[PDB]
Structure formats: structure tokens, C-alpha cells
Amino acid sequence: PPQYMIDLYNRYTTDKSSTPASNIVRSFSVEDAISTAATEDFPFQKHILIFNISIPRHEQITRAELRLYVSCQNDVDSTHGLEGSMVVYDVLEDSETWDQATGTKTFLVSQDIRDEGWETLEVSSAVKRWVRADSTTNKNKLEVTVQSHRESCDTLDISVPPGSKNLPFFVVFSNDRSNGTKETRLELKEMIGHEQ
Amino acid sequence: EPPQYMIDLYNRYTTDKSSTPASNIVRSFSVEDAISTAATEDFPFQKHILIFNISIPRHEQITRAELRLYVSCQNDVDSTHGLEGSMVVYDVLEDSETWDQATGTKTFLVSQDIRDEGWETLEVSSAVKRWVRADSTTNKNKLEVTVQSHRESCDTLDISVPPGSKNLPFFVVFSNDRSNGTKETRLELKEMIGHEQE
Amino acid sequence: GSHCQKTSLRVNFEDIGWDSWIIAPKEYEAYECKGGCFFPLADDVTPTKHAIVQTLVHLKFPTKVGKACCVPTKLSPISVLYKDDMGVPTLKYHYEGMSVAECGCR
Amino acid sequence: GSHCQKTSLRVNFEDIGWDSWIIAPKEYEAYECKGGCFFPLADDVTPTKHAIVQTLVHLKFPTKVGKACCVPTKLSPISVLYKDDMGVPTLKYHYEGMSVAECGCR
Numbered sequence A: 001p002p003q004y005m006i007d008l009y010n011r012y013t014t015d016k017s018s019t020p021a022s023n024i025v026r027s028f029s030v031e032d033a034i035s036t037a038a039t040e041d042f043p044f045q046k047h048i049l050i051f052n053i054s055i056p057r058h059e060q061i062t063r064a065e066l067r068l069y070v071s072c073q074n075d076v077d078s079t080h081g082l083e084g085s086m087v088v089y090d091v092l093e094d095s096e097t098w099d100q101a102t103g104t105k106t107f108l109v110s111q112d113i114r115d116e117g118w119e120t121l122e123v124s125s126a127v128k129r130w131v132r133a134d135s136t137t138n139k140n141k142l143e144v145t146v147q148s149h150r151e152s153c154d155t156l157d158i159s160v161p162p163g164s165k166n167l168p169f170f171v172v173f174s175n176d177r178s179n180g181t182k183e184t185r186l187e188l189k190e191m192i193g194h195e196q
Numbered sequence B: 001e002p003p004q005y006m007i008d009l010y011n012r013y014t015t016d017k018s019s020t021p022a023s024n025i026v027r028s029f030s031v032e033d034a035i036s037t038a039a040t041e042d043f044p045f046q047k048h049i050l051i052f053n054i055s056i057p058r059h060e061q062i063t064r065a066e067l068r069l070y071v072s073c074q075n076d077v078d079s080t081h082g083l084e085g086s087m088v089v090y091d092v093l094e095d096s097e098t099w100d101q102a103t104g105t106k107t108f109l110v111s112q113d114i115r116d117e118g119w120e121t122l123e124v125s126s127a128v129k130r131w132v133r134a135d136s137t138t139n140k141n142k143l144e145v146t147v148q149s150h151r152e153s154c155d156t157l158d159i160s161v162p163p164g165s166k167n168l169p170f171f172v173v174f175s176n177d178r179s180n181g182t183k184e185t186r187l188e189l190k191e192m193i194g195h196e197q198e
Numbered sequence C, D: 001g002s003h004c005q006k007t008s009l010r011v012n013f014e015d016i017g018w019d020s021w022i023i024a025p026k027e028y029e030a031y032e033c034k035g036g037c038f039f040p041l042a043d044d045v046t047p048t049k050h051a052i053v054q055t056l057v058h059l060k061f062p063t064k065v066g067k068a069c070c071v072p073t074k075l076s077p078i079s080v081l082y083k084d085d086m087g088v089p090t091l092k093y094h095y096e097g098m099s100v101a102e103c104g105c106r
């Protein structure tokens, strides 16, 4: 479990005078990742991030964050710079051929990057569609493209599987439709299971 | 002392649990004082000003009020010649220490034709509702009942009132709570704690 | 002292001296919650999170912390005819909180 | 065994084995209701009508009917970080019913 969740806990407890907008917060690590390197046709890194986000029907989510670790991937001459941009798309239709070069996508967030470290992408829209799945089109995944600029790192990318460090994860903020009624009901049943 | 009307209302409510009444709270208020003026040539009817002490808590919303009167020909000889007439109750707004009906300001409540000797029920909700919102100013909490005897009837047709001790007038106030039982059960509790150490 | 449950309890107002103001009824079924809140607390006792916590703490430290108590949950009203503090005869179809509807551990 | 009141109760999740899913906090103040509901019941225990009745009944028949129990009234929430059944990290600002706000006789 990410320390981001832990710091959020510390934030809530130290600021009793300042109540947060969302009660329920969940962390979802990436389930699987499909990575395609930059080509002359598509000069950028392509990543399809598969998650397993499952928020209960009785809950109404408010915000979702996609946290990515931007880093120059240990290339020689890495002191030459680290600057570019990245774009995340909600994948509707995929295809086991190329990434970006196929399927249907809905653009979520455009992010310019500079510092090595964690970036936060507000991709609430995508998760809301994932919650109301309505079967039909298979989703619960998104595509992130990383565009390296001229005077920058040749290996500018986000840390993804099959890597083991600084992997992408979701942070879903949620509240209860019944204003905490149905929530505490299920919390009780949960605790009874954990009781024995 | 508690009227059997209240007791019968309990029995009605309890034996018919399948049929919930429109009003939850019911209170009985017996007449506090009565000013009686006999019929005169100028005003050919019995006059009664009935003074009550109706006090319903502010947080409560009353729905209905009943004035229960005992109509009877006062044991006159030749009363067997018939018993039929009418009676009218007025909500007294401004009174005057002179006569009854012949003075003051009244707002008419109910006109009632009478036949049987016995208890009559008068829908006088309006008067009590006005009494609850007293707002000081005009002194009220009382009403005037006139009893009109018809031609072929008793010359002494009237309602049983003080200083008599039997079949006296009384109020039946039906009420519910504005706070939907919150403030109601709070005060019931505080009262009961009083009755706990009783 | 087995399982937290509702038991019969007939209450006569004459016995408790409430016949001085209670006109009706003379007696009624008030019910009573008997039994202990022993581990584990199940759905049928509508436990709270604190009750579950306290029960486990009691289970762990029985000499320092007691266990949850079997008390009435929701209460059912009865019809009551009585005299006010001013002596006014009063009838209430729903005199809330007089009898036990459900029991539970708290 | 004096007066129904709220007392201090520090609960460590490690002690009760809840450290397997509760991430934070490690321990918290849950409080406990101690004391008896002895006659008479005052405002400070927010008694119900049934509680008052049963207490009076207890006075009359102490060998057959017990007295009201000192239990938590309303409960206060705490902040809790934990893992779901699916192992999903979950943070809730208001995890209701973990600590005692008020006590009373029921």
C-alpha cells in the first residue's frame, strides 16, 4: 500500500479544522502493462495501463488520480536534459497490434513534464465510465503516451511494468449515495467477518 | 373524574389498532366557570358564557376541538308536550361585565338543532386555535352558548352547566406534534422522570 | 445468560405505583432483553463497531474491560390514557418507547 | 458500579488481532461506559421510558427482573486506513461507531 494513502491519513488527522471533500479513498495499483517503444511513425512511448478498479454501486465517486513516475530511464548522456509532455487516453476499443496506432480513445489529460518524480493526472471521467460499466464495451484500462522533446532525454518515459519500482496506481475518491447509511451497514458486516 | 368519553376513546383506539386515528394527542378540559342568564323578553333564549382554561403546548399543532354539552329540559311540568329547539355557540372575543349576548364582541362558531336529551358535539376547532395563539391583547379562552327553545317545547330548555355538579360541559382537544414526536417524547420523558420519584 | 434476546415482561402499573396517573392500561407487555453479548456478535444482535471492539478487548482483557450489554434497540409505542401534571386527562395512541421491539449488544 | 458514565479505554488493534487489516491507527481511544443504572434515573443518562419502567419493576421484583444497562448512546467516528477483502487500501475520514460520544441507561 502506497505511502500516498498514509500521508492522506496524516493530512486528515492533523487538520481536524479542515474537513476533506471526500470520505472514502481507495488505492488501485496497475494490474498489467503493455508497452510499445517510440517509432518513426509514432515518435513517443506508448503505454496501455490495465487496472482492476471496482467501486460498489451504492457509492458515488468524486475524483480519480492517476499517479505516474516521470524519469529518464538510466540512459547514457542523461545529463543532457529531462523535458517533454505526456497524454493519457481512456481506451474504449483496443487491438492487439500496435498502441496508439489503433483502436478508439478519448483524451483525458495533457501534461507537460520537467522534474523527475511523481505526476498527478486528474482522470476522474474515465473511472466514472468504468464504474457504470453497463457491460458492452470492455474498458477499465487507459493509454498513456510520453512525448520526448528535442533538447531532452532519449529515454524519457514513465516507470511501468514489468519494472518493479515506482509503478503507476489509481487513487479514487468516493462518497456514499445514501450519505453514509448503506456504507456503515456494510462496514458492520465487513467487521463481523473480520471479527472471528 | 376523567370523562368516560376519554376512556371510550382509549377503548376505541386499542380495540381498533388496525384503524389509526387522525389525531394522536387527545386532552379533556372540563368547564372552569359558567355565567348563566335566563331567557328574557328582549332575548328569548338561555345565555351561557363558559370559561375554560385550555392550555395546549406551543410546539403542538391541534387538529380538532369538540365542545360537549348536555341538552336537557330542566324537569319542567308538562315537558311531555315536546322537546325540540336549537342552540348556538359563539367564540367570545371581547366580553363585558353586564349581560350575556346583549353585549361584547362575538364570532359565531356552530349552529346546532337539538332533539334528543343528551350529549351534543360541537365542532369548535376555530376558537381553540385562536386561543392557543393568544398573543395577549384581547382576553379570550371563553365562549358563549345560547339555547333557543322552539314553539312546541319546554320553556326551560337548556344545557346542564355549573353550579350544577352533573353532566357539565367539557372540551375534547385533538392534537399532533409539529416536531413529529421529537420534542413530544422529550417532554414526556422529563415528565415521567418526575413520576418516577413520585 | 445465553444469547441476547427479547423475553416476556408483563408490567402492572399498580405494582410500580403508576396507577396514580396511568388510567389505561392497567398492565401491558413491556418485554425485556435477557442474555449476554458473548463472542461472537452476529447479525441477529445488530452490534455496533464499538460493541465488536469492546467484546474482543474483553475477550483479550476480561479483568479490565467488560463485555457489551444486551439492551433494547428500537422501542415500540403503546396506547396510554393518563392524567397530566395539571390533572388533565390525556390520551396518546402512540406513547413511544414503552415496549421492546428488538434487542442488541452495545 | 457507581454511576453510568464514560470512562477511558485505549484499544490496540495488535492486541485484538486487527493489525491484519487495520493499517492506521495502531491504537485509539474507544472509551467505555461503566457504572450502574441505579434508581432514580436522571437526565444525565438520557433514559428511555422502558428503562424507567424496568428500573421500577426491578425495585419490586429484583429476583426476577434486572435493571437497565449502562451502554453507549451516540458513537463518534474515527479516521481509519485499512485493506479491503480484496486487499484494496481504503481510507475513511469518518469510520462511524468506533468511540463513545455519550453514555446512558437502556
Ligand SMILES: *[C@@H]1O[C@H](CO)[C@@H](O[C@@H]2O[C@H](CO)[C@@H](O)[C@H](O)[C@H]2NC(C)=O)[C@H](O)[C@H]1NC(C)=O
Binding pocket: A052, A053, A054, D086
Ligand atoms: C478484480 O475485481 C473484480 C471485481 O470487479 C473481482 O471479481 C470478483 O471476484 C470474486 C471472487 O473471484 C467474485 O465473487 C465476484 O463476483 C467478482 N466480481 C465481479 C464483478 O466479477 C476480481 O477477483 C478482481 N481481480 C483481481 C486480480 O484483483
Ligand SMILES: *[C@@H]1O[C@H](CO)[C@@H](O[C@@H]2O[C@H](CO)[C@@H](O)[C@H](O)[C@H]2NC(C)=O)[C@H](O)[C@H]1NC(C)=O
Binding pocket: B053, B054, B055, C086
Ligand atoms: C390554567 O392553565 C395554565 C397553563 O396550563 C396554568 O398555568 C400554570 O401556572 C403555574 C403557576 O404556579 C405554573 O407553575 C405552571 O407551569 C403553569 N402551567 C404551565 C403548563 O406552564 C394555570 O395555573 C391554570 N389555571 C388554574 C386556575 O389552574
Ligand SMILES: [Zn+2]
Binding pocket: A040
Ligand atoms: Zn521511415
Ligand SMILES: [Zn+2]
Binding pocket: A083, A084, A149
Ligand atoms: Zn518543451
Ligand SMILES: [Zn+2]
Binding pocket: A085, A112
Ligand atoms: Zn507543452
Ligand SMILES: [Zn+2]
Binding pocket: A150, A151, A152
Ligand atoms: Zn540537444
Ligand SMILES: [Zn+2]
Binding pocket: A056, A059, A182, A183, A186
Ligand atoms: Zn461502501
Ligand SMILES: [Zn+2]
Binding pocket: B086, B113
Ligand atoms: Zn334549525
Ligand SMILES: [Zn+2]
Binding pocket: B076, B077, B155, B156
Ligand atoms: Zn315551564
Ligand SMILES: [Zn+2]
Binding pocket: B057, B060, B183, B184, B187
Ligand atoms: Zn407535547
Ligand SMILES: [Zn+2]
Binding pocket: D058, D062, D067
Ligand atoms: Zn437493585
Ligand SMILES: [Zn+2]
Binding pocket: D077, D094, D096
Ligand atoms: Zn459522520
